[PDB]
Each structure stands twice: as C-alpha cells, then as structure tokens.
Chain A
C-alpha cells in the first residue's frame, strides 16, 4: 500500500526528465518488476535513477 507512493518518485522523474510518453511506459515496467523483486526501498530509488540516466 505504502509502496504505491513510489509512483510519485517516477512522477518526479517525469517532471525532472521531460521525456516521451513511450519512455514513461518503460520506466513504469522497470519500476514494477524491481518493486515486485526488491524487498523495501533505497534500491528502487537508485535503480530508477540509474534507469532514467540511461534512458535519456
């Protein structure tokens, strides 16, 4: 339930990296798989930051 708040994270990225709508789908899929794999936190932020850096 609380992990859903992490969407705002990528939403910040959506504002931080003004990229295409198609790349938003890629970011969402990567985040969903990581969250279903990772335990709690502090790796989602790092992994999603690295993905956003390697997507633009």
Chain B
C-alpha cells in the first residue's frame, strides 16, 4: 500500500477513492496529501482510533459530518487545505475541541454564519488564508483564549472596527497577518480593543499618505512591537507620518520594496526604539544629513540596492547611526568615498561593499579615511573594478580580518608597500586578477596571513627570487591554479609547515617531472607535513620521481587525474598511510600490481582508477580483480568504467567479469 517508516502512513501520491482500511491500527500521520477523496464518514475511521495528525490537504471533501470528530478524540492538527468546505454549519464541529492547530485555506467560505466555534480551549494557531472572507467576526463572546498566531493571509477585508474584534477582548496574539487585502478605512479604535495585539503584518497593501498618517494614530496606545509595511506604497516621508507611533513602543520595521524616493528631514525621528530597519530595494536618490535623525537605536541596516543608478551621500549623513552594527551597501552606484562619508559609525562590524562603487579604480591613502575610528571586521570589496592599489591604502584599517579583493582588475607589480598596517589580516582573496608580478619582499608586512587565494592570477617571479612565500609562516591554504606556472625552484614551498591545501590544477609542470631535464626532477613538494590535500591534476606528468612523496605523511587526498601519466614506479605510495582517497581519472596506466598500487589500497575509502586502459591479461589485472572481490572500500560503481582495451585477444571486458580462474 503506502510507505510506512515508523507510524506514518505516507500515502502521498497513491490515487485512492476509499480510506486505506488495511494499514496498522496505530498510525499517526495519515498523510493523504493528494488522494482524491470525497467523504470522511464515522464508519471507516473507527479503525483509526489513535490518529493524531490527519493531513488531507489538496483533496475534495465537500461535507464534514460532526460524527467524524466523535470517533477521533485524539486528533491534534488537521490541515483541511484546498478542500470544498463551502457550506458551513453551526455543528460542523461542536464537541470537536482537542485541537492544537487548524488550517482552512482555499475553502471559499463567504460567510462565517453565527458562531462555528466557541470553545477551542487549546487552539494555539489558526489559518484562514485564501477563502474570500470579508470581515473578522468569528464569534460573539470571550473566546480564542489561547489563539497565539492568527493568519488572515489573503482576504477581501475593506475596513476594521472595534466591535468586529470585541471577541478578542482577552486574546493574546503574537503575530497577526492581514496581508494582501485592499483596505481603505481604519475606523476609530481597532487594536486597543484586542488585549495583547503584539505583531502586525500589512504587507502588499497600498496605505500611503492620508492613510498611514491616521494608522500611526490608531496604533498609538496599542502594544504593537513588530510592524511590516513591505511593498506598501510609500513614495515619500515627512515628520508627521509615524508621529503617533512615538507612544506605542515599536521595535522592528520594514519599508522594503515600496519605491522610497526621498526621505524628509525629520522623518523617523519619532522612533527611539526601532532596532531593526529594512529599506532594501528602493529608489533612493539623495540622502541628507538629517534624514536618519532619531535612529540611535537602529542596529541592523539593509541598503542593498536602495541607491539606484548619481547618488550623493552627504557629509556626516551617518553620524546619528551610533548603534548600527551591520551595513549592507551591496548593489548601488555609489560614486566614490568622500573624506567624511562613514563618520560616526563607531559600532560598525560588517561593511560589505561589493558592486557598490563605479569609481574605485585606484585606492590611495586618503580613500578609506572616514573609517579611521570605526571598528571593521569584514571588508568585502569584490567587483569594484580596482585597477591598482597605491601605497598605504589600508593604513586606516587595523581591526580588519577579511580582505576579499577578488573579482577585480588588479594589474600591478607588488612591492610590499600596499599592506602597510593590516596587523590582523586573516584572509586575502586575490582570485580572478589580471597579472600580479611579485618580489621577494612582496609579503614581508603581512606575516599574520592565513589564506592566500591566488587562482587565475598570472604569477611571475616564482623562481627567480629566493621565495615570495618565505615570509608567510601561518599559511593554511595556498591556492595556485589557472596560472600556467611552468617553472619552480626547490625552495618555492619552503618553511611552510602548517600548510594544508596545495591546489595546482591548470599548470604546465609536465616538463619539470621528466628525467632528461638538467639537474634532475624538481623535488618541490619537500618538507611539508600537514598537507592534507595535494590536488595535482591536469598537468601532464608522464613520470613520477621515486621518492618525491617522502615528506607527505598525513596526506588524505592525492587527486591526480587528467595526466598522461603511465607505468608508475615502485614504492611510490610506500609511506603514505592515512590515504583515504586516490584519484587517477584519465591517465595512461596499463599495469596495476602490489607495488604500483598495493600499499595505497589498505584503508582506502574512495578509488577513481576510472578511464586508464590497462592491458587485458591475466597477469596485468590479477591482484586487482582479487582485490575487487572484497571491497570495504566504498568504490564507485564498477560497471561501464573499467574496460579491457589493449590486447585484441580479450579486448572489451570489465574487470569484475574477467575469468580469474583461468590464470
């Protein structure tokens, strides 16, 4: 019948006309979420006298007899979603009160009639989302004594009155939602009738001027804490709007997606207690100094793409945001940083300036001046089209911990004078740059570095100097890919002991692991101890030195593929112990045996010896096919991956199907 994991009859999509009637008598979640039923009588349900979470969503029930609840006193949550409970009755559920949550969405109930429900002593949450309701009269007397979070999500309500809410005399509401309903009247007295109306959602309704002005009056002397007017058309603002919200102590607000053009002088000055503040996705074109007056309690600010494509942040326009902690200036055309832009932000901790500027071609010393006194732990700075970092451009940043300078156009010859200061640098994301030639002293001013990402950065001066990476001693990651580095000295990676990743992918080192090169093959993976991952791939090493891998003992990934590599030497993996991966996709290996790949296959958990065409001989793959017999190694699928190709005598055969007994 249906999948049954522990006590849930997950008859999700099993087109049924009747009830299951043959599942265990102790199921809890009869999740008939699409099964096209029409009736729920009090005969078939006596088998399920223990059902608790009945979900019959997305199904056509047109009638609910009261007797159905008589046989189900253990039900807690029921989701009558997308049903046809159109014609309601006084006793459609009279003594059916042991619920804890209820939904009646997409039922099209035009009228609530007189009093469908009066007891509901444990109805914490109730939803009536997409019915068609045009009022809020649910009962007559004190009622809903435990309804915490009502949801009138999408109705045709056109007003609000105190008498329509008198049934909420002593009802504690946490979050009340009246979104997506066009309202053009708020009759005097609506929310101080409700005992503890705490939250309120008015998203996506056009309130605007001449309506919000009296709305802030009505909410005055009402215990409302949260509020959200997202997409509620607010073209402008002044000092009279939200005046009445001074007495009622609000804590969170939302003006996102309402196309806010200009902010008035003393607007939002009547909000001493606004903690969060959301002005994202707006068309703001000018930000006066006085505009944010009174916002001394705003902690989180969101200005992702409010400053539409030129805006002019005036001088000292943020001096009143003393308690700001997280700025989000992300998708803007802000034209440069003036000398007094971020003045007063002595509580900032996260800046996130990426895709914000269109003029930061160069970073001079007098460019980050305004953040001299500001704490700043993160400085994103991606996609800012930086051409070249001049000297002492970060002298003002001492608390900075992440310098994520990727996705830029930084083409310059580094010298070391661009990092003066930066005593707390933990990350320098320099990926996706044009060209970065180095010197021996290019990193002597940052010995506190931890993650030097240098992918897709043509990196010169890697061999001529002693080592550009000698000063770095606390480096964990050294990413070098897409650079076409074609020469390395025996001291490129020297002294770096706690390095843990050595990514090297689109590199033409194929020439320097030959045998005919002058001086012998380059032994550059020398001395390292904590190299957990060594991703040497897509290079073309058709040879491996006998004892190149001596130092690597705690190595766990030796991903080495896309390499014309063939005929491995002996004792190549003699000393690697914790080798929990060994990837050789697309090589030229023709022979595998106990010295070539033996000691690697001991505690292995992944093997990728996929596309190398071994000679198909009883001696070429014998220990291999007697090793694939018992595989505690979580080998990938052995079908259509291992194939005989070389000898015409037995060409075209998977290794598992090779008759081992013949040899």
Interface presence of B392 (CB below 8 A) = no
Interface presence of A39 (CB below 8 A) = yes
Q: How large is the interface on B (under 10, 10 to 19, 20 to 34, 35 or more residues)?
A: 20 to 34
The answer to whether B581 touches A43, judged by C-beta atoms less than 8 angstroms apart, is: yes
- B533-561: contact bitstring with A at CB < 8 Å (1 yes, 0 no)? 10100000000000000000000110100
Contact residues in B for A2 (Cβ distance below 8 Å)? none
Determine the main DSSP class of A at the interface with B.
helix
The answer to whether B503 touches A37, judged by C-beta atoms less than 8 angstroms apart, is: yes
The answer to whether B427 touches A33, judged by C-beta atoms less than 8 angstroms apart, is: no
Contact residues in B for A22 (Cβ distance below 8 Å)? 377-378, 401-402, 426
Contact residues in A for B608 (Cβ distance below 8 Å)? 39
Least CB separation from B426: chain A residue: A22
- How distant is A32 from chain B, measured CB to nearest CB, in Å? 10
Interface presence of A18 (CB below 8 A) = no
The answer to whether B477 touches A29, judged by C-beta atoms less than 8 angstroms apart, is: yes
- B609-649: contact bitstring with A at CB < 8 Å (1 yes, 0 no)? 00000000000000000000000001010000000000000
The answer to whether B451 touches A29, judged by C-beta atoms less than 8 angstroms apart, is: yes
Measured CA separation A7–B535 after assembly (Å): 22
Measured CA separation A42–B636 after assembly (Å): 13
Measured CA separation A46–B426 after assembly (Å): 25
The answer to whether B503 touches A39, judged by C-beta atoms less than 8 angstroms apart, is: no
- A6-45: contact bitstring with B at CB < 8 Å (1 yes, 0 no)? 0000000000000001100110011001101111111100
Contact residues in A for B501 (Cβ distance below 8 Å)? 30, 33, 37
- How distant is A36 from chain B, measured CB to nearest CB, in Å? 8
A26, A37, A41 — most chain B CB neighbours (10 Å): A37
A37-B557 contact, Cβ under 8 Å, with A43-B580, A43-B606: yes
The answer to whether B532 touches A47, judged by C-beta atoms less than 8 angstroms apart, is: yes
Measured CA separation A25–B476 after assembly (Å): 14
B427, B503, B557, B583 — most chain A CB neighbours (10 Å): B557
A38-B634 contact, Cβ under 8 Å, with A33-B501, A33-B503, A43-B606: no
Least CB separation from B559: chain A residue: A37
Measured CA separation A1–B426 after assembly (Å): 30
Measured CA separation A22–B426 after assembly (Å): 9
Contact residues in A for B535 (Cβ distance below 8 Å)? 36-37
- B400-415: contact bitstring with A at CB < 8 Å (1 yes, 0 no)? 0110000000000000
Question: Which listed residue, A25, A33, A47, touches B479 by the CB 8 Å rule?
Answer: A33
Question: Which listed residue, B350, B426, B533, B636, touches A37 by the CB 8 Å rule?
Answer: B533
Contact residues in A for B377 (Cβ distance below 8 Å)? 22
- How distant is A47 from chain B, measured CB to nearest CB, in Å? 7
Interface presence of B605 (CB below 8 A) = yes
The answer to whether A39 touches B581, judged by C-beta atoms less than 8 angstroms apart, is: yes
Least CB separation from A43: chain B residue: B580
Contact residues in A for B450 (Cβ distance below 8 Å)? 26
Contact residues in B for A36 (Cβ distance below 8 Å)? 503, 535
- How distant is B558 from chain A, measured CB to nearest CB, in Å? 9
Measured CA separation A47–B500 after assembly (Å): 11
Least CB separation from B537: chain A residue: A37
Contact residues in B for A40 (Cβ distance below 8 Å)? 606, 634, 636
The answer to whether A42 touches B477, judged by C-beta atoms less than 8 angstroms apart, is: no
A42-B451 contact, Cβ under 8 Å, with A29-B477, A37-B557: no
The answer to whether A34 touches B557, judged by C-beta atoms less than 8 angstroms apart, is: yes
The answer to whether A39 touches B477, judged by C-beta atoms less than 8 angstroms apart, is: no
The answer to whether B451 touches A26, judged by C-beta atoms less than 8 angstroms apart, is: yes
The answer to whether A43 touches B401, judged by C-beta atoms less than 8 angstroms apart, is: no
The B498-515 residues at the A interface (CB cut-off 8 A) are: 500-501, 503
The answer to whether B477 touches A38, judged by C-beta atoms less than 8 angstroms apart, is: no
Measured CA separation A38–B535 after assembly (Å): 9
Measured CA separation A43–B377 after assembly (Å): 32
The B549-586 residues at the A interface (CB cut-off 8 A) are: 556-557, 559, 580-581, 583
A22, A36, A38 — most chain B CB neighbours (10 Å): A38
A21, A22, A33, A46 — most chain B CB neighbours (10 Å): A33
A38-B636 contact, Cβ under 8 Å, with A22-B377, A29-B451, A33-B501: no
Contact residues in B for A21 (Cβ distance below 8 Å)? 350, 378
Least CB separation from A22: chain B residue: B401
Least CB separation from B605: chain A residue: A42
Contact residues in A for B533 (Cβ distance below 8 Å)? 33-34, 37
A39-B583 contact, Cβ under 8 Å, with A22-B426, A33-B477, A47-B532: yes
Beyond the given A26-B450, A40-B606, A43-B556, please list 9 additional residue pairs across the A-B interface where CB-CB is below 8 A.
A26-B451, A30-B477, A33-B477, A33-B533, A38-B557, A40-B636, A42-B606, A43-B557, A43-B605
Top 3 closest A-B pairs, CB basis? Answer: A39-B606, A37-B535, A37-B533
11 contacts across the A-B interface (CB closer than 8 A):
A22-B377, A22-B378, A30-B500, A34-B533, A36-B535, A38-B557, A38-B559, A40-B606, A43-B557, A43-B580, A46-B580
